[PDB]
Design a protein around this nucleic acid. Structure first.
Ligand SMILES: Nc1nc2c(ncn2[C@@H]2O[C@H](COP(=O)(O)OP(=O)(O)NP(=O)(O)O)[C@@H](O)[C@H]2O)c(=O)[nH]1
Lengths: 619, 258, 180, 70
RNA sequence: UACCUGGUUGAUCCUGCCAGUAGCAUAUGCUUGUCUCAAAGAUUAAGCCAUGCAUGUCUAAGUACGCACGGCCGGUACAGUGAAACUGCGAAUGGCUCAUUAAAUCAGUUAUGGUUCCUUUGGUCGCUCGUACUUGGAUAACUGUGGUAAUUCUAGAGCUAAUACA
RNA sequence: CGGGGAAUCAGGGUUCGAUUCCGGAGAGGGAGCCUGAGAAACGGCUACCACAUCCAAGGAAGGCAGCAGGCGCGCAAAUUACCCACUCCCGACCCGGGGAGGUAGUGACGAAAAAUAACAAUACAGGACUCUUUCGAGGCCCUGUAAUUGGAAUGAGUCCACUUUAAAUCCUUUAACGAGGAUCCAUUGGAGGGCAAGUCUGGUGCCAGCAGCCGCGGUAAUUCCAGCUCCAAUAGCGUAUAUUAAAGUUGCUGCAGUUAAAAAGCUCGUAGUUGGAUCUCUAGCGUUUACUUUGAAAAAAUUAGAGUGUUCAAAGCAGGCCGCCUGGAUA
């Protein structure tokens, strides 16, 4: 037991010491993890499709992307695009090979709430000339500065001038020097502007072939989006930068540094995890401890799936089965009970060393700002998303918009999900909704939702889901205000304006000035002191001749009032005099009605009169 | 189901083979031949289970494909070939000849014969017909169709055929006071003498047989086979003389031997 | 379809009334006298006796000249003479009904090992058998519920390998001999 | 509210202080009380009793052999 | 082992059910040292399926001009092993599941003298009164030119076999 | 789906039978057909209906209720494993192939055997047997709540070597190690009655809870939450739910109907059921049945049951003797 635990800890220590003293040096380095960030529609992706030469870019059902993925380019492609311009080191032995990871950029869900699972060895920042710098670009370079990693900056829309001589697949220096002079001056002016715009943000940037001294300097590489001029210069500078800088960090050692990157629900596969397998020769039919939402899960690997080389984790491709796999690749893993898991955490692979635990409180420190904040105890909206990243994005939107959420799930919508939305319906009718992002609605779920009072918000583009939800909030506010009206009588204290033209009865035309609160139509009124005599439902409030919705805290409003059908209507002089005060009839029902769901239209700093009038009306 | 069945489950095989439950799921499945699937014996069973020569199924085809085994003086390499009642299995390698006779308890017994007796076989005639310019024909229980039979041979008579040729040497009429053997029902394998038959028109004829030990039993006509003329058999009998002795003296005999 | 048999049988019947003084006593006497592990072992012998008695009872109803009754009766009596709960004198079917649980519990290897004076207590015998010290004929048995045959009684000897009989010191004696 | 037919029932929590371990909007396995779908000696108009809470047995939470998953 | 016990009353004797008692199956709780035997997505959804596999096959004995191999003997049509393809046979068995189905299915008993039947095993196969020492044409395989984003898609061109087709 | 059967059980019965053997049916729903001896075939095709895959938008391709596996559904069910070696099937075929099938993995569905100590030596204001009237006397026989004393025996684990196996595993076999809180630790439910076991001691105060039923809790709780002790079954024991016996509370055997629940308000009457004595063989018959006794026919498996030391047993159909003598009954 404890002696097995003690020797288990000591043999773990032996293994990691062996895996530290192993340490293979002298070339054969690890493939760097090249990250790519942007604003919204800069060109952070589709440049990757141009690198890998993939025809399908526009097949996203929208201009924006909503997931992480690694394209996995391997040396033949590097050599193929290298031989085109042929700079340095023909058939270089020293190159591991390239691994590019694509990141989705957007204002909402704050650039994938990133937290870009760090591991951004070489970060590529699209600047995109046409629009200059962007707020997500400044917050991205702030994030890149927060954890000090080396990153470079690439331009995208250099050909978009109308006058660029589009000579594709050639040197940037050549293509720039083969244009007219005025355009070069315009490019060097906006280059200077970008250099100053980085210089002010605690950087030192320059144009990729001057000095260069990339120790302190950063490389402004001009690239064309559509044509592909600079793609050679890009991959050259990437391999050069990685060869020069990352000489020791990228050693092919034998530690266990597999990281959980994405979680996906695929048909006939269960719940699959995309992992960037960096260090650790993990085997098919070997136990792994995946860090979960509701504690860690012991998972048995059924097998290793990899997409074809120069292809993304975008569209369901012919994923080839691999029994085992070396530590330089990004692979998809599937097993048993991978339901609730956390993204951007390291993955421990375990042999038969009798259960090696307790590495979670040492990970879960100040990264608790995730799905774990679930209020099953309380009420809330139901949320579903294609991948986990999207689910986090929806929850942090709900957090920002101030709405509680009860249940969350990954994959398509089912009859249990609409039943959880139904069991909510009893508590708060508004909250009984399902926010479904880029997932297949089922017929049985949809027909069960339509048969009950449960609405589902289906949308592939996240803008539609946000807009649809907010529209529903305003629609429910309108649906609440109208058809549940005049019960919130609203606080009203009227002072009589003496020597005004009175209409006696049927109707009563009364010239008044409000002293406490504001006065609108349909508020019942009462006179105290003379017992408690009542005038039910004021019909219209008018200034001089014109109609008004509210009183302006001391207005000369002539109000038309028709007392409710009783045995006798009340008369001026006989029952109530000009000296007597006019006070609104506020009860437990009315105060409770105007307490909740009247906090936006409700008065600003006059509240106290309610507490001051409920005490005299006895509440 | 569609078309004919090709398999046979082990427990669904006929009981007189004495296949055990655990050895497999399937059985031998006797192939089409002269004798019925229910009332035949695959060579795989005879070699492997009865003679104890082969251990596995491969050794049986390794024996048979080397062409050491004849049935009625004709070489058969089919390991699931049906050899039934009165069929003479000949192993000319080891010079051993067996005739398939049912024993008292109602199963094919490993009954050896002299090589001189492995020359002929007895056969019960099923029908008699004539056709195409009137050469009369005969058909027997082991499906041997013979042309120009002796006109004294009527239906339910027995004929003795030389195995090297296909011609009738001698024949026995089915009359009162003739040695017969039962080949179907409760009384299967019992040898006795005919006393009488009771003809039931439009139904099965029932015969009464008296045993050598004063035991009298009845049987259907179809399950009778004349083996001897008068009381003397024309073939050798099994270890027991076809005498159904009861469980009482079965125990007495077994305890006496001990 | 699979080439496996599913022929499994329950060997004990639980009592109708779970808590009943007079009964619990009677079972605990049997355990105490013959050092049995649990009340399952008493119910086992009750169930086997009951089945033998039911077989005798359903044989009695048939006529005295019936071949089936004669054969079955003789076979049952032969087996009960063979196991050693009767003798040649009292070998009538009627006397099968006059047996009891004591007669069957006497024939346990545990009981015989105690009664022949190999073990010096009813509890020691069960351990000695279970520890692979005892052997019948040339066969080393470690089954307390081994029901000994009448003719197999006259040789229960210590298994030759055994320290007690065979002449080879065990772990304790070896360890004490090395540290001696 | 049940999962299959989605209709409302009232279930009696068994042992002392077991109500503390349950919270509103949790997944709960309920069993028949014992009298074949009839009432109990004291508690009127209930047929059912809670056996598991949030995929954990109430006996385990009562005896402290497990802890409510967080 | 042909068995009963608590509960209406201040107490009694009843009718009468509720409760207890034991067995058997499905679930489930907590516990779990050794060894043999062993059921297992039937109930609800005969609801829906990614992926891999589950039906193929050659002897001396239908067709061998693939140098894919080396071998005679060198004027010997065809030494042999044999991919590919044509030809023959199998794929209608096996396995799965229980939606259907109420004199239907099915079970025991009889009938085909009212029918078909690959295969095996026997019988029959100059019983017919009128180029033969071996007749004719093609198409695969192979070579060569192709189309389509795409499939176990296939067109055109040049040879050559039969137990294929005549 | 129907049978062979299963659970329960005095005799009679009641309930279950999707599920390994037999027969039927259908491959998402219907319909139509080619080939062939055999199909209205779906791991064949053709169309429509419902779902759904790829796409260059022109067209292309679909069928797990085969084995794995996944989603859904729900209280409810295993590995994307290895092999044709066994049992058999198919082919031109001793030679090839087979998720039929076999072998492992998951497996407290359930069934059989069976650990968690045994013996010896010490003292009892211990018990019985002998002496003395009592006190008080012993190698005659028992005893425990001794962490007292002692060596003897040993499987669980660790791990050579085999044997087993297509290759492995498990078992059996056997070197080395392995028992003094033998801490190498036995649980699950009860202790008022039903019903075996405490009117012991803290706590709470008709609150918390227990309680299948009757009932217990309102300041001395035999029943709640705990401690200690005891009882029950024991590697298992609770709980829920369908079902059987109990139920002579579905009554044919075998129940009720004056008042407990119950005989129509009354009579006629068709179908239905029931119905008084009596009558002592010449190849065809005798007036024909029901009834009863005998005979042949009736798949194995299952059930009863003969034989057989699986090390015993549940099982299995084997085995036994110094090349032999057997069995694979019987009902
Ligand atoms: N000429 C030119 N085309 C551009 C430029 N930027 C984008 N495009 C084109 O505009 C279209 C949509 O841009 P896209 O690459 O999807 O932008 P993104 O910022 O990568 N989008 P996402 O958020 O999905 O990553 C594509 O056809 C792309 O090639 C640019 O600077 N110049």
């Amino acid at each position: 037991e404890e002696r097995a635990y003690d020797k288990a800890k000591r043999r773990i220590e032996k293994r990691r010491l062996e895996h530290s003293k192993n340490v293979t040096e002298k070339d054969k380095l690890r493939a760097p993890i090249i990250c790519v960030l942007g604003h919204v529609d800069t060109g952070k992706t589709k440049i990757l499709d141009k690198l890998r030469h993939t025809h399908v870019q526009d097949g996203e059902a929208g201009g924006i992307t909503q997931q992480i993925g690694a394209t996995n380019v391997p040396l033949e492609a590097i050599n193929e695009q290298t031989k085109m311009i042929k700079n340095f080191d023909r058939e270089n032995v020293r190159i591991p090979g390239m691994l590019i990871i694509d990141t989705p950029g957007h204002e909402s869900f704050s650039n994938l709430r990133n937290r870009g699972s760090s591991l951004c060895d070489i970060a590529i920042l699209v600047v995109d000339i046409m629009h200059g710098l962007e707020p997500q670009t400044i917050e991205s370079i702030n994030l890149l500065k927060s954890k000090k990693c080396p990153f470079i900056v690439a331009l995208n829309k250099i050909d978009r001038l109308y006058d660029w001589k589009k000579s594709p697949d050639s040197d940037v220096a050549a293509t720039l020097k083969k244009q007219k002079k005025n355009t070069k001056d315009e490019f060097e002016e906006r280059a200077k502007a970008i250099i100053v715009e980085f210089a002010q943000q605690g950087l030192n940037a320059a144009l990729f072939y001057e000095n260069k001294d990339p120790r302190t300097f950063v490389s402004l590489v001009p690239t064309s989006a559509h044509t592909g001029d600079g793609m050679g210069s890009l991959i050259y500078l990437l391999v050069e930068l990685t060869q020069t800088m990352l000489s020791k960090r990228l050693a092919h050692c034998e530690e266990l540094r597999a990281q959980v990157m994405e979680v996906k629900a695929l048909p006939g596969m269960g719940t699959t995890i995309d992992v960037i397998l960096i260090n650790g020769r993990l085997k098919e039919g070997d136990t792994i401890i995946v860090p979960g939402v509701e504690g860690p899960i012991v998972t048995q690997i059924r097998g290793l799936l990899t997409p074809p080389p120069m292809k993304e984790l975008r569209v369901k491709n012919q994923y080839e089965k691999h029994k085992e796999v070396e530590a330089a690749q990004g692979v998809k893993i599937l097993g048993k009970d991978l339901e609730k898991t956390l993204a951007g955490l390291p993955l421990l692979v375990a042999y038969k060393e009798d259960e090696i635990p307790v590495l979670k409180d040492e990970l879960i420190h100040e990264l608790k700002q995730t799905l774990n904040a679930i209020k099953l105890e309380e009420k809330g909206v139901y949320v579903q998303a294609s991948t986990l990243g999207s689910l986090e994005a929806l929850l942090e939107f709900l957090k920002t918009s101030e709405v509680p959420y009860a249940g969350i799930n990954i994959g398509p919508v089912h009859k249990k999900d609409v039943m959880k939305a139904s069991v909510m319906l009893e508590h708060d009718p508004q909250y009984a909704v399902i926010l479904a992002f880029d997932v297949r609605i089922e017929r049985d779920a949809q027909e069960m939702a339509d048969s009950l009072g449960v609405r589902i918000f289906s949308a592939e583009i996240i803008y539609h889901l946000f807009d649809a939800f907010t529209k529903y909030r305003q629609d429910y506010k309108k649906q609440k205000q109208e058809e549940f009206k005049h019960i919130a009588v609203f606080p009203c204290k009227i002072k009589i304006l003496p020597q005004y033209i009175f209409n006696s009865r049927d109707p009563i035309v009364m010239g008044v000035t409000v002293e406490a609160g504001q006065v609108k139509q349909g508020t019942p009124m009462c006179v105290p002191s003379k017992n408690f005599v009542d005038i039910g439902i004021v019909t219209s409030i008018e200034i001089n001749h014109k109609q008004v919705d509210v009183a302006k805290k001391g207005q000369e409003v002539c109000v038309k009032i028709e007392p409710i059908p009783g045995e006798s209507p009340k008369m001026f002089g006989r029952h109530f005099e000009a000296t007597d005060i006019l006070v609104s009839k506020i009860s437990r029902q009315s105060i409770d009605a105007l307490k909740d769901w009247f906090r936006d239209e409700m008065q600003k700093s006059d509240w106290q009169l309610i507490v001051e009038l409920k005490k005299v009306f006895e509440i | 189901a569609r078309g004919p069945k090709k398999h046979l489950k082990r427990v669904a095989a006929p009981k007189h083979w004495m296949l055990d439950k655990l050895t497999g799921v399937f059985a031998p499945r006797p192939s089409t031949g002269p004798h019925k699937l229910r009332e035949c014996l695959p060579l795989i069973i005879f070699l492997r289970n009865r003679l104890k020569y082969a251990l596995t199924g491969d050794e049986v085809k390794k024996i048979c494909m080397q062409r050491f085994i004849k049935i009625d003086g004709k070489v058969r390499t089919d390991i699931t070939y049906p050899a039934g009642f009165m069929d003479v299995i000949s192993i000319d390698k080891t010079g051993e000849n067996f005739r398939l006779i049912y024993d008292t308890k109602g199963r094919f017994a490993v009954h050896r014969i002299t090589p001189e007796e492995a020359k002929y076989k007895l056969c019960k005639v099923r029908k008699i017909f004539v056709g195409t310019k009137g050469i009369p024909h005969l058909v027997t229980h082991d499906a041997r169709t013979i042309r120009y039979p002796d006109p004294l041979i009527k239906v339910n008579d027995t004929i003795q055929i030389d195995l090297e040729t296909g011609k009738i040497t001698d024949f026995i009429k089915f009359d009162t006071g003739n040695l017969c053997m039962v080949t179907g029902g409760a009384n299967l394998g019992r040898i006795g003498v005919i006393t009488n038959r009771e003809r039931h028109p439009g139904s099965f004829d029932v015969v009464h047989v008296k045993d050598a030990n004063g035991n009298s039993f009845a049987t259907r006509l179809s399950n009778i086979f004349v083996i001897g003329k008068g009381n003397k058999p024309w073939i050798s009998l099994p270890r027991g003389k076809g005498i159904r002795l009861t469980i009482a003296e079965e125990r007495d005999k077994r305890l006496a031997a001990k | 379809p699979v080439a496996r048999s599913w022929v499994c049988r329950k060997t004990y019947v639980t009592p109708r009334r779970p808590f009943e003084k007079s009964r619990l006593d009677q079972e605990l006497k049997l355990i105490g006298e013959y050092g049995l592990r649990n009340k399952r072992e008493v119910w086992r012998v009750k169930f086997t006796l009951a089945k033998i008695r039911k077989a005798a009872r359903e044989l009695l109803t048939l006529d005295e000249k019936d071949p089936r009754r004669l054969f079955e009766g003789n076979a049952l009596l032969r087996r009960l003479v063979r196991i050693g709960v009767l003798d040649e004198g009292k070998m009538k079917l009627d006397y099968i009904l006059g047996l009891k649980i004591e007669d069957f519990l006497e024939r346990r290897l545990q009981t015989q090992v105690f009664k022949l004076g190999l073990a010096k207590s009813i509890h020691h015998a069960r351990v000695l058998i279970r520890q692979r010290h005892i052997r019948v004929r040339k066969q080393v048995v470690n089954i307390p519920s081994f029901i000994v045959r009448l003719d197999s009684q006259k040789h229960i000897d210590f298994s030759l390998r055994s320290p007690y009989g065979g002449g080879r010191p065990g772990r304790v004696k070896r360890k004490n001999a090395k540290k001696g | 509210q049940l999962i299959k037919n989605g209709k409302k029932i009232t279930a009696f929590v068994p042992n002392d202080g077991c109500l503390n371990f349950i919270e509103e909007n949790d997944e709960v396995l309920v069993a028949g009380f014992g009298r074949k779908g009839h009432a109990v000696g004291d508690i009127p108009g209930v047929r059912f009793k809670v056996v598991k809470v949030a995929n954990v047995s109430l006996l385990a939470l009562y005896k402290g052999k497990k802890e409510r998953p967080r």
